[model samples]
Target: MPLAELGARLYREKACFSCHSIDGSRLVGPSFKGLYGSTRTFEDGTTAVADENYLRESILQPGAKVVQGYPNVMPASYASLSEREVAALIEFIKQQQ
Candidate 1:
């Protein structure tokens, strides 16, 4: 399957939509929309740019960086997600805008 298709499949299969939304609105977690280039602020007053690397790290290590308004409640699925899958998800998120 194409990376994008694989990403979509994995996204749905993993039930990521349960907590996250593609639009720029808050669900259980921060929305994926317009997050690529924006700065995410953590509750601890730390901020990080939402670059590809940041997104990748956020997925692989959920609590590595926390968004301010949201709690660190994301469960880590890196063990189940291959690197390619993660990349595809990142690409999918980048295209959200």
Candidate 2:
């Protein structure tokens, strides 16, 4: 399977859909739709672009930059994912838009 395809599969296997919505609906976390390349506002009033590095960090260390108005409840277990796996997931997220 392609890298993004693998990422999509991992998204489901990793149970990301339970908290994150791909269709822009509100959930435990912010929606993944159009998340990539967008701006992110943290609860602390700091803002940053949701670029590649941001996405990577968000997946591995979710608490590093909590999106404003959303709960900081993402599991840190994704830190165990391989570098390539993380890359795949980012690619998949990029595809959402």
Candidate 3:
């Protein structure tokens, strides 16, 4: 299978699906459904699109800008994931749209 396909599986292997949903619904965090290209806001009332940079920042350092309705409850250790793994996650997110 392609890396991106593996990435979709990795979303679960990496425990991302546990807190997020893939079928256009909310979970502990926001849903992965139609997430890409969408705009989201921060606790400070600032808004930005769900672009790669934002996803990357959220995965590597969620504390940088917590989502408006989501809490800063993610583990800081998620940053320890390798760049390749992070890329996989990002690809999976992008494909959701």
Candidate 4:
């Protein structure tokens, strides 16, 4: 599927906008814009790059690495998403960057 369509669908289906902003600002979670390919600072002063694997890990295992200045409030949604959906979401996040 097209990246834009897939992203829009995922965004709505997952209710990501409720806690996340697309303009690189903070809400409940970090913004999706410019998130991909950038280094993420965690609350513990640790940082990690937003690669494909990292994005997948964030979605599947959010508590594995918490983002800086944000509480680990992400619910695990991997069980509801198929592998292809996860891929599409990652692609969408990459484009945002």
Q: Write the per-residue lDDT of candidate 4 for residues 31-82, one digit (tens) a residue.
A: 8998888988888898888898899988887688898778888887664777
Q: For candidate 2, what is the lDDT?
A: 0.89
TM-score of each: 0.89, 0.95, 0.90, 0.88
Candidate 4 segments exceeding 4 Å error: none
lDDT of each: 0.82, 0.89, 0.84, 0.82
lDDT of 1 at 5: 77
**Candidate number with greatest lDDT:** 2
C-alpha positional error of residue 39 in candidate 1 after TM-score superposition, expressed in Å: 1.0
Q: Stretches of candidate 2 above 4 Å error?
A: none
- Model 3 Cα lDDT, one tens digit per residue, 1-97: 5658878888878788888898888888889888888999889999999898988888999688988888677668788988887888888889886
Candidate topping TM-score: 2
**lDDT per residue as tens, model 1, 4-82:** 7777777777777788788777889988888789998888898889998998888888887788878788886664678
By lDDT, the better pick of 2 and 3 is 2
Prediction 2 TM-score vs. true: 0.95
- Give the Cα error of residue 86 in candidate 1, in Å: 0.6
Angstrom error of the Cα, residue 11, model 2: value is 0.8
